[PDB]
Design a protein around this ligand. Structure first.
Ligand SMILES: Cc1cccc(C)c1-n1c(=O)c2cc(C(=O)C3=C(O)CCCC3=O)ccc2n(C)c1=O
Ligand SMILES: Cc1cccc(C)c1-n1c(=O)c2cc(C(=O)C3=C(O)CCCC3=O)ccc2n(C)c1=O
Ligand SMILES: [Co+2]
Ligand SMILES: [Co+2]
Lengths: 364, 363
């Protein structure tokens, strides 16, 4: 059942912004670890004396890393009008490396902002004109994470990012096959008030529910190409550990999709030792006898063999299979981690959520 | 002239520690950018809930990256007893990614501390025993940068780093040939008072002085294997550092390799995908000058490779310096790196062989 109850036209994921201690360090390591070359910048070298922002890109995946300058800063040169230097300094201290903004492209950032706050959204940054048709607004998502709306005409899709961001070419830099954001998951202490608030102001509909040490709900836009789950603890748990160390609600993981995840993972795992991302240790060997039974009709024996070699997990639902693997936490604290995935099947384009989210795997 | 006036036995550089709000990002990028595999850690996984510390090593070169935990942090579990979460949070807000500690191995950290403050050093952390014979002490160097003394018996050497740190094996991880710290440079608004204070409490002796716009003074220990220069601006690149850093601090660290061109080939191969960028190569007429000045030391092939990589060549009395500088290593136009090789002065190699690049201010 899809009621298509979006209160505003929600087109797709646009970017994720991490407010960093040092944007050069975080973007540099993520570039190497993910195979996502630098694609745009706004900083002192482009006339922005308020914040340093670096935009990494792989396929349609856009990661924005932003840090505040401390001295000589003219707040009027910020390419992101919502930026506040003291808020970013506090944010990095409160959390370590952490997602500040989940950004969706909407038909009209002002219309989405107005509809959101009328339906209970706590305003974060009222809509502004970024220039030549670009609009931006923010509302509170959970904790100190904001849901950012950006809008611009389709004819502007050739531009690097947002006004004020200069493009950066990547001639001698190829990617590792990461193609798109699939889902972004938040942890909250109480799912029911947080889901009621968030689904309430967006009109996003329940896509999936898993109850089980967590209770989870997946919220989706009309087309279900925007997937934004929320988790709560039950009652020591993985969700509570996050909340304690993080200091509040926050983004727990971002799932990044590839059309060939085994090839992507071989490249990422070659980088782990020297400063890329380490991955969770592979399951016991009997896990993959299970994979042969549950998915041996759609995965070849060789593919399952590669899955075992690289440690990837396999789950399946009705007519779809999910390959997934998780990184260890990507900052200092046991909080944020990444999920790298491939979805197989549900070609009806591919229907969102094909293969589910890995519920079958929590018996590791 | 070397008066060998050290107030305490100063053995060698031991490590440099950067304070950060995010150690994992900085140590991650430095690891593949410089080719320094992770070699030790102290954090939640080792029983330390106060700070997360990552130790990168390449040869004798050791970089420590430390960030405070924010919630449920028990300061009493810190592996670094001088660590203070409140001071580290202030440090990151004030400076961004920046050097906090320049650490020297001394014969006895307690004696080095006592003799220093007796000679005017502003104390920063009184000497403490870390166990297994390790002692640690800190005095103020300039601004918020401390000079850290560490001492331990030579039968300890095989310990990963300091007590409380757990080794990281990094299975088949390879370095890019960086082998040791050559010198570490601080910027200050006024050279004469800063040097009077610093040379005063250490007994380090003046090794060289230069005028560019900057005035500089190199201080050295007795053996001259520890080189700690200071710059002031001329009333500028130095003032831009002070403005954006918020005060005095470490401007650059020079990292030596026994084969800098091979090292730089590996570092520059990492630039496009998140490694460090380097200052652009000088124009071809500069390298005609290198041929005139250094054709008795470098081959034509080396000079052509220097040009390809952008490395600068300078020379003093019977020594040659090969050096190249990175762009700033973080967001702010503050800290940067110098990658070098020294050629000649084999009498081991005499410290400071070939100078610091005073010639290279014309290119
Ligand atoms: C990575 C890790 C570290 C330490 C402890 C644990 C449980 C895990 N961990 C996961 O966090 C995990 C998450 C999902 C999944 O991504 C999904 C949530 O289950 C709720 C719905 C939406 C979201 O997409 C699936 C499988 C998982 N598995 C199997 C796993 O082991
Ligand atoms: C890298 C960069 C960026 C923007 C502006 C400039 C001047 C530079 N820059 C340097 O900072 C630089 C520093 C030294 C040198 O390392 C040395 C100082 O000259 C004083 C003595 C101790 C110290 O070790 C030598 C050559 C240099 N050159 C050639 C150079 O261009
Ligand atoms: Co997931
Ligand atoms: Co130098």
């Amino acid at each position: 059942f899809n009621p298509r109850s979006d209160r505003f036209h929600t087109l797709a994921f646009h970017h994720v912004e991490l407010w960093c201690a040092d944007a050069a360090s975080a973007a540099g390591r993520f570039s190497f670890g993910l195979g996502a070359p630098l694609a745009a910048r706004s900083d002192l070298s482009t006339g922005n004396s308020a914040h340093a922002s670096l935009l990494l890109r792989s396929g349609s995946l856009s990661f924005l890393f932003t840090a505040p300058y401390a001295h000589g800063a003219d707040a009027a040169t910020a390419a992101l009008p919502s930026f506040s230097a003291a808020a970013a300094r506090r944010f990095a201290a409160d959390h370590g490396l952490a997602v500040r903004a989940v950004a969706l492209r909407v038909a009209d950032a002002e219309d989405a902002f107005r509809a959101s706050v009328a339906a209970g959204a706590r305003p974060a940054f009222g809509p502004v004109d970024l220039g030549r048709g670009f609009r931006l607004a923010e509302v509170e998502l959970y904790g100190d994470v904001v849901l950012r709306y950006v809008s611009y005409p389709d004819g502007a899709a050739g531009e690097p990012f947002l006004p004020g961001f200069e493009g950066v070419a990547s001639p001698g830099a190829a990617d590792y096959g990461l193609s798109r954001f699939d889902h972004i998951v938040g942890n909250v202490p109480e799912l029911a008030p947080a889901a009621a608030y968030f689904a309430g102001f967006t009109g996003f509909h329940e896509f999936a529910e898993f109850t089980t040490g967590l209770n989870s709900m997946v919220l989706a836009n009309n087309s279900e190409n925007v997937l934004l789950p929320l988790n709560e603890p039950v009652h020591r748990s993985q969700i509570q550990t996050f909340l304690d160390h993080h200091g509040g609600p926050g983004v727990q993981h971002m799932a990044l999709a590839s059309d060939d995840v085994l090839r992507t993972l071989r490249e990422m795992q070659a980088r782990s030792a020297m400063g890329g991302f380490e991955f969770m240790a592979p399951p016991t060997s009997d896990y993959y006898d299970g994979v042969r039974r549950r998915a041996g009709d759609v995965l070849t024996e060789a593919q399952i063999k590669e899955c075992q070699e690289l440690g990837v997990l396999v789950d399946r639902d009705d007519q779809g299979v999910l390959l997934q693997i998780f990184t260890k936490p990507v900052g200092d604290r046991p909080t944020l981690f990444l999920e790298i995935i491939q979805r197989i099947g549900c070609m009806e384009y591919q229907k969102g959520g094909c293969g589910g989210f890995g519920k079958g795997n929590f018996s590791q």
